[PDB]
Structure formats: C-alpha cells, structure tokens
Design a protein around this nucleic acid. Structure first.
Lengths: 187, 147, 51, 105
RNA sequence: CUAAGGCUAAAUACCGGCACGAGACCGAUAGUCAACAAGUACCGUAAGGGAAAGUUGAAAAGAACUUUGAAGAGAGAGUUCAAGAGGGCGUGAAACCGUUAAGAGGUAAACGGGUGGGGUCCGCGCAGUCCGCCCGGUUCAACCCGGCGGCGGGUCCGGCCGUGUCGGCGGGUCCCCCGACCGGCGACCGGCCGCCGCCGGGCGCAUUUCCACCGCGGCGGUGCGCCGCGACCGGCUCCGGGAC
RNA sequence: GACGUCGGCUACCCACCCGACCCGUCUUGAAACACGGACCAAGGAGUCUAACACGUGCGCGAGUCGGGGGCUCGCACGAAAGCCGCCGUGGCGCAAUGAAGGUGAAGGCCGGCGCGCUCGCCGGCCGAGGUGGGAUCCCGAGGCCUCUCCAGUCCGCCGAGGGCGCACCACCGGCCCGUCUCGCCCGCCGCGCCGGGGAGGUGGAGCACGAGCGCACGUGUUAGGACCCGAAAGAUGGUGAACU
RNA sequence: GGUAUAGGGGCGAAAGACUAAUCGAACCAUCUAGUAGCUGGUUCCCUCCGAAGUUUCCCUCAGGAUAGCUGGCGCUCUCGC
RNA sequence: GGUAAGAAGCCCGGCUCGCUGGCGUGAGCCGGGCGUGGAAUGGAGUGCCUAGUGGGCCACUUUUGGUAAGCAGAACUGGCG
RNA sequence: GGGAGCCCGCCCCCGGAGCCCCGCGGACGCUACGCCGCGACGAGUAGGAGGGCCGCUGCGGUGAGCCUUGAAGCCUAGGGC
C-alpha cells in the first residue's frame, strides 16, 4: 500500500548495441572493461557513444575536424570520433592529424596519410592511452539530417518555419490559401 | 516476415488491437483525401497550408530542357579538374593560371558560394554570378563566357 | 584471387573500382590487449570481496 | 483519414489495375532469346559486323545536352555526294543512309 | 514538312490450341467445379444451376470343407507376418451407445482451496545403513644411461620473416640491395640452456602400485520410511520479579 | 521397522468444511426475464502490391544506386551468380527564392587613393562571427606520504584555481531570393523607358565547412476486395403466356 | 388445342390484380468479393507500462479531425566514486 | 489565484548609439570584486513514431429547472468504469 | 644520496612467504548475449512494448541424427519437468 507511480521507473537508455557485428561487440567489451576499471570518464563516454545508433553518431567532416583541431590548446592531441570521418572536397590545406575513428572514407584516409597524419582504431587508442589522455572528443552535427527540418512547430502556424511534407515542390502544390495573404490568410 | 510481424502477438485478443468500444469499421472518416474542407479542415490547415487555391501563370507546353541549367559553386571548383592541375599552380614562376571548363564538367552557371583559394584560374561557363565574378577577379582570374 | 580482389594498397585491376574492406579493429585478440602492461598500468584494484 | 502530419498523396489505383498487372517473370527468358537471336544473326552474316551498318556522327538538340555526340540514323545525301559514294551503293556496302537529314553547319 | 493514294518483317502481346520442362505452391472439407464412368448424376419449361465420391493386401493367396438356420447371419477349419487388413476392407480419434470392473448417490449437475479413505500401477527391500578421498593395522616410480617428442627463454647467437624511417632514383600509385635504429610483432628455422612427457635398460624391495578385511580414525555430500531430543540465532504473543 | 509393510507433492473414484450464479459481446450497468450457443471432428478471419512518415541494422559516402541492356551456358544445381569507357544516360542529394521575366548564399582586420562621407576604388593579412550554459581534454599552485634529519630526481591519488572549449539550446549579429521606403554614385559596342551597387523593415520549406544514396526489418496512414460475413438498390445481355 | 401481346414491358369488367408456388416492377448470368458512419465474430503463453468518454471544427449528434490522456524509441546532463 | 525568497544577483571602470535629451537619459557592449539566499521532499531536461478514447455513472459539499423522482443539467475532489 | 639514532656486517629469492593478501602466474565463477552482490516494487479493460529452450508447415546448412530388433499417427487408472 504505497503510492509510487511506475510510469517512468524503467530507464530506456541503451545497455548493449543492437548491431550483431562482432568487431563492434569486441570493442564494446574492451571499453566496458576500461570504463568499469579506470576512473576516467572518457572511457564511459566512448562506451555510451558506441552504444548509440547510426543516426545518433552522424559522420564527421574533415573540414569540421580540422577547424576543431585548429583551436588553441589542443596541439599534438589525438582526435577521437565514434562515428565516421568523411572527406571534404572544399578544403585544400590539410595539416597532419592523429585521428581515431571506427571508419574513415577512402578519400579522407588518403588525404590524412598524404598529409603525414596518423589514423588509429579504438583498440590502438586503448593501447596508446587507456584513460584517453591527450584526446579531443569530437562528433558530427546531430541535427544535420534533413529529417529534423520537418520537426518542431507544425506549418500553418504563426512564427513557424518547418518544412512541410510535400510530394513535390512547385507552383501549384502549395503557396496558396493559408500561405498567401491574397488567398484567405497566411501564417 | 509474418513471424516478426505484430499479428502473431494479437492471437487470442478479441479486438485484435483495434479497440472494442469502437470497432475497426471499413471507412469511418472517408476514402482517401475526403473532406479537405469539411471535418478534416483542421488537419489540412495545420499540416498542409496552401493546399487549396490556385496561384501563378499556366504554362501549357513546358520543357525542362529549355530551363535546364545546373549550377556549381566556387566552394567546389578545383574538384572539377585533376589535383595535379592545382599542384602545377602557384609554381613555375610563370603565372600559368590553368583553364577549368565548367561546361565540360557538366555545369552551365557558376555561383559564388564558398571561399576560393589564392590561385589564378580561367573559368569558362555560359553564365556567371556577380559575386562569383568578383571572387574570381579578387583571386586573380578571368571569367570567360561560352555559348 | 589477388588479381580478382586486390590487396589493401592496390586496386583489384579486374573489378573497375573495388578494394578490400577496412578493419574496424586491427588487434582482434582482446585477451592480449587486456593484460598488456599499458592497460594494467592504469587500472584500479578489482573488488571481489562481495558482501 | 489524415493522421498527425502525413504526406498528402493520391495513389492511382482506382481502376482495375489487378487485371492489367504486367509481370516480369519472363525477363531472363526474353534476354536469353534476344541473345540467341543476336548470335544467330551474327552467324548468318559471317564477315559482316555484328552491330550492323555504320552510323554517322550526330549532335543533340534540346540545349539541355547540347554537347553530347551520339550515333545518327544515317549518313546524309550531301555527305555521300561529297565523299563520292552513291546512295544506293552505300546501302549494299553497309552505310546507313537516311534522306531526311539536313546539313546546316 | 508536303496531307486528302498504297506495301512492308525486327525488337511487341498471348489465362485459347498442340507438345514439353520447373516449383521454398495444396495434398482429398486443401488444390481447377471435376485426382474416381465431371460439366457426370441430378434440378428447372428455359436461359442456366451443379455435386458427393481415392486407399484390403507384397501377392486374391478374396475364407476350400464340416455344422445351425429358409436366408440374411453365425460356430469351427484355412490363407496371410497381420482379417486385431474379410470386397466402401490402411491408420480408426471425439461427440454417442452397449457390456465388464470399482466407487458413489434425498438440496440439478459441475468447479476452486485443504485433507482423509479406497484402487491403478511406479521405486524400493528378504537392512537401503549411499559412497568418494587421506591415514593406521604383481612391479616400479625415487636416481642414473640411450633415443624420441613437446614447452619457454635470451646473448637476437646465425639465417629467413616481417612493420615505420633513413639511403641507391637503383624499376601520382605499385617493385629490389646492403648498412643502421626502432616495434622483434605467436611470421618461420639451425644450434644452446632449463623443464616436462613417452619408450627401452639398469634400480629386487623399510620405496612402488594393485585386490580384500578390522578401524565409523580425519573430510564431504547423505540418511529407505516414521520420529524424538539438545544448544545458538532471528521475528512475535506473554509471565514472574526487583529498582528509580 | 521390515515379505503384505513402506514413499508416490502430481493424476482415478468417493466423503467432509469453506468458497463458489454461464460463457462471448453491446453497455455507466449482465447470472440476467438482453442477444449467439445440443455435442463432436475438419476449415475459418489484419494478407499482398504500390506510395509515404518515423525508428533500427548493413554497405558506400558528397556522393550513392543497379532500373533497363550487353558479355559469360547447352538452365541439374540456374531462370541463380560474376562483370560492364554501359559506373551513369537517369533517380535522390550537393541551392534556394519569386507568378514570372530572373536572380542566386562571406565576411573581417590593416596600409593607401577620393572629404573615411558608416560611401566608392587600390594591396596585404586572418579566414565560417559573438555571448551564456556546455559532456570530455590541458595547465595546475599545493597537499597526502615513505622506519630518523636534510637534499632529491621519479611512480602516483586528490587537487583549489586557471583555459581550449565537441554535439546541443537560448539570443545577438552576417549572407541569398521576393517585396516596401529614403537616397548617393558607377560601366559601356550600341549613352537608353540600359545594366549594377547602399542603408533601413519585412516574407521564404533557405546559406552560415555537408549527410546523403541503396537494401532489409518494425510501427502508423492511405489506394486497391483490403481483417472476415451481411443488405434495401443500379446497369448490361438473354429465357419464360405448360399457371394466370 | 393452336395462336398474338415479354419486363419500366405485356395484360387487366381495375383488386396494384396476373405475368410458371415471387409481382408497388418476373427469372438466369455478369459488372460483384457493389457500399455501409450499422450488427456479429476476430485463434498461444508469460512479463512490464497502462487510459477516455474532455477542448474546438465538420448538414456534426451511433462518426471523423484536432489538442488531451497512453506506450515505445532514444538522446543531453548531475551523482555515495 | 498571480508573484519574489539571489550567480540568469549585486558593486565599480571604460566604450557604442543614425533613438531621446541643455548638460542628461535609456539600451547594448567589454574588464575586474563579491557565493550555500525561507521549511520539507525529490535526479532533472529534451526530440520524434504513436494504438485506443471522444455514449459515462455514482458519492461529501455548492447549486439550476421541477412538487418530487433510482429525473434532467453544472463546480471541486474521490471512486466504479 | 649525504648525515645519523632510541663495534661492524646482513635486513636475502615465493619453482616456494605459505596464505584474510602476495602488484611473479592466476576460478570450482569466464555459453562476458555469461556469472555474482545489494536495495525498492509487483492490481488492471481498451491499448502499447519485450521475452518465448511455446506450437504448425515448407526451404538453405548442420546432428558420421532416429528408423522393419519398428517412423508418423492414435489411446492410456503409469513416471515426470
């Protein structure tokens, strides 16, 4: 006879990756041991990000990684990205880097190796710095997907700039009553 | 896979997951897009604004080939040419300024988006934007019009 | 087989654009990694005195 | 009935489409038949090219492309006259000839 | 571009017709209506409507013959591995019925929880005191010799192998040489050492290993069934005292 | 206690005490004098295609793709599988905004030339802005010590405090297109009812160093027969005056 | 007995009477698995969470849309370290 | 029934303003100094896919129509559903 | 490392110190989708989700699988989970 609301007693956070691939599970075991032994929170963050789904770890662009490493203070530090590193074609000068990532695109890998940089996997990063010392943790833009453009306040509402679900943009598919001031109203 | 589908977990449930106060009738709300103005106006005005009503001028025999004009930004311009072309640039103590044919790469108009590296280049394209031309002139190139 | 699939530093030369997939982790043997001096140098003493 | 921001779509399935559904289970057999017919024709014309008559250089209308060069229907009469080839003899020699093509440039 | 004239195969379609191949398809209330004398029997004046219906047995070897009965039906006998397969006959369930055995029966029957009584067999036993280790009361380990095999190791010992850099430019990406450092990485070998195992020789009996017993001596889970008692703890309902 | 004695929680029958109204459904309300219901066996109802939206898994990644076709085989396995200057004609995305003519995403600092005129023109430099909150990473005074006093490089834990600050949120600015207002100058093959530029508001599904493409799976919404069964009706073409 | 009139037609001393046991629109086949906001039914187990008959609009009142109530998927952080 | 019970707060110093003004305002920019801001309990925030429901009823208290109703219709809270 | 203390020297290695911690190697516990230890909670229609070493059918692999010394199927007052 106790009044406790069991509505949110079960936490929905992930515990193991849903992927059935074996290399990711081996990395999960390694970082589980590292997080439960070492006092560093870097291992815990890396394990949590490894648990995340594909959409929750967007790819990181080479230009974004370059601009994040160019910040003063993180000189000679290894970049740790749980997603994938993708080449950026609109950048010419690429300094040498120390990048740790699950995957790297072929073009980005060629660019980094030609620039004189070094690319490491997560097991190599664990062997080098078990507690993640001298590491810069980076991630891609979470809201970069076009899916989030359709989220938020619904269209046809004042002060809303949400992209509606339209079969094909055009003159006679929208921008009519509800959007034109000359036809009914607008928001 | 019906094995993984939901219908296997609904075996034994009387309503089959569709309520018992109001049964899963055939078409209660109307078929398709019925009632765009009546009894679905709230949804049609809060999720598809501008659905009803005409706007603009009619064009009977429209051809996409006449208005076909792909665009490329100065953000990605040297990607159209080989990397060794840019390697043989800002060098040789001559001011080579190689020629990049946009039409050959597959674009007609060159737009001014992005930063252009400090390297002269001859850009040949059907159409140019004012800002793109200004960027090219500031870099030290020349815009060339082609038909 | 090498001319069909190629190595990691050479194209297939029989498939127009194909290379072998990259490994997500190289040192697959985690048993060797866990008991390495580098990792064990930065580990706390495990607690197995369950109460 | 619409439900919480779904795309407004109009499927074109109001006719008796199930009666006019066209399956493609005969695609591999059709490909095999075409391959056999092509091989039979090639064996029929033993020294003649498998592809067939020569096709001229042709540019494209519709300025969308405006640059691509493709094979033409046949060689023009003025082109044959300049090359010194009779139009009827060209058909027997294996030169595609069409009498509708113009020559502006 | 040249209408009011005309011809022409090819790539195209084919739930009808002839002959074939195939199946992640159904297996006789399923699959075509039709697996069988199926558009058959049958119904309606007619346009039309339209079923049900597979399985004895390897082989009919389909029960000769005697006997009761008019016969249908039996009782013997016989074939078959099997008629406990006997011509709508493989397997033969449920509803329902007849008979045998047991139990019970005035609040319709039936159901849940808790026991008790009687049967069905099941597992014991002609005591079941279940064992498994250590200790007490026929040959070899111990120790050497020879052979074989295996593991680990460094002077990286010598040669291969192999990653990063430097070098001969020697033949943007791809190949060889010696020299050096580093990671010498389970990527391999030849000698060396240490250890282990096996075989063959010595080692003849205070060692060695078997088989059995008298010790319930030490340890561990257990007792065939019915039980009883003791001490400690935890949670409770109480009782008798003394003192502020 | 051991040849008619043991154990069988469960299941066979019976007896006792307590409880106990027949299932499904509509309903605020069912045991209902509400509806379906004798019993049993077999069949039986959320499927498939297409278009979407979201989430998840995989591959590639500012790219992605196999649709169609072709090259290998006589098809057992195969109508599979491999490959393509077809590797991309073409779809999606990489650019949006206007009805359209059309336009179309970057700035800042420093020196100079015009009157620095919040304006224009010449060179160099930095090159996606700023504030607040920001997981993590860096420096880190100092402390904790060590069998005695001092000196003391090392392996450490804590570490006040000080910073670079991922992703993300709030805001301030900046840029692109349409539109309104005030205004001053630029260019010429054609000096015009030419074209371009500024500042200040506003509208956009926009830019502000990217995240998409293909396949598979799950849920939801639809068009289709559309979870299964059910009408009173409508249309087309044929057959009936053997009854009346 | 023969014959003529056949279905929005025939015929009717008129009853909406007869038209093959059916007539205020005969019978057979097809469209057709016509539509239903209305009945009825909707098939194995366990575990966890767990509602509403309320807002506004609709020729809306036995129904839908929209908010509300609900479930699932997560994600960003703080810490009896 | 709204508020306030502090770091998103106070105290200084200096810049910008095409707004407003005699000097002044007012707002925005930068640099520096000051921390438990009443009691008690809780770990919080955020984004999408989203079934069913949109016939209710009863009870303490207030109350509308009705003579009254196991009548019809409202307000808070709690129940059955 | 130097100076020394309530005459000098050792103050040693687990192939063995023998253990309530041994940092030299480490389960009976390690199907790490596994095992182990603490707390709190357990109602439920419509509805959602998760786990089924629950069940039926056919296909690709796999049990040197079962089987005329007896398969599927059916019956059972037997032993069971």
């Amino acid at each position: 006879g106790v009044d406790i609301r069991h509505n949110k007693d079960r936490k929905v956070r992930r515990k193991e990756p849903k992927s059935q691939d074996i290399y990711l599970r081996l990395l999960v075991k390694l970082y589980r041991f590292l997080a439960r032994r070492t006092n560093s929170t870097f291992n815990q963050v890396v394990l949590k990000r490894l648990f995340m789904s594909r959409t929750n770890r967007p790819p990181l662009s080479l230009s974004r990684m370059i601009r994040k490493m160019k910040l003063p203070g993180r000189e000679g530090k290894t970049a740790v990205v749980v997603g994938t590193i993708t080449d950026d074609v609109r950048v010419q000068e690429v300094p040498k880097l120390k990048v740790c990532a699950l995957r790297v695109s072929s073009r980005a890998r060629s660019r980094i190796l030609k620039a004189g940089g070094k690319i490491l996997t997560f097991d190599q990063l664990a062997l080098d710095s078990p507690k993640g010392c001298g590491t810069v943790l980076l991630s891609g833009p979470r809201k970069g997907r076009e899916v989030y453009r359709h989220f938020g306040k619904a269209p046809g509402t004042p002060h809303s700039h949400t992209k509606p679900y339209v079969r094909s943009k055009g003159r006679k598919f929208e921008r009519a009553r509800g959007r034109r001031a000359s036809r009914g109203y607008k928001n | 896979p019906s094995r993984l589908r939901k219908t296997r977990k609904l075996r034994g449930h009387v309503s089959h997951g569709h309520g018992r106060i109001g049964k899963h009738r055939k078409h209660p709300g109307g078929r398709g897009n019925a009632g765009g103005m009546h009894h679905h106006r709230i949804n049609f005005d809060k999720y598809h604004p501008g659905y009803f009503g005409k706007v603009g001028m009619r064009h009977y025999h429209l051809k996409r080939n006449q208005s076909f004009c792909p665009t490329v930004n100065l953000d990605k311009l040297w990607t159209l040419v080989s990397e060794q072309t840019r390697v043989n640039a800002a060098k040789n103590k001559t001011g080579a300024a190689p020629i990049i044919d946009v039409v050959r790469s597959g674009y007609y108009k060159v737009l001014g988006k992005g930063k252009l590296p400090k390297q002269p280049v001859i850009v040949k394209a059907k159409f140019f934007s004012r800002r793109a031309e200004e960027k090219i002139k500031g870099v030290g190139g020349a815009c060339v019009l082609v038909a | 087989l090498d001319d069909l699939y190629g190595t990691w530093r050479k194209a297939a030369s029989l498939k127009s654009n194909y290379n072998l997939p990259m490994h997500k982790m190289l040192n697959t043997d985690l048993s060797r990694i866990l008991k390495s001096p580098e990792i064990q140098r930065a580990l706390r003493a495990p607690r197995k005195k369950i109460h | 009935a619409p439900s919480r921001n779904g795309m407004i779509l109009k499927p074109h399935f109001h006719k008796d489409w199930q009666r006019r559904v066209a399956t493609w289970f005969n695609q591999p057999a059709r490909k095999i038949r075409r391959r056999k017919a092509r091989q039979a024709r090639a064996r029929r014309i033993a020294p003649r090219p498998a592809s067939g008559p020569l096709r001229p250089i042709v540019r494209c209308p519709t300025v969308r492309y405006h640059t691509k060069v493709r094979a033409g229907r046949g060689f023009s009469l003025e082109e044959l006259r300049v090359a010194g080839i009779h139009k009827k003899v060209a058909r027997t020699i294996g030169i595609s000839v069409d009498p509708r093509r113009r020559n502006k440039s």
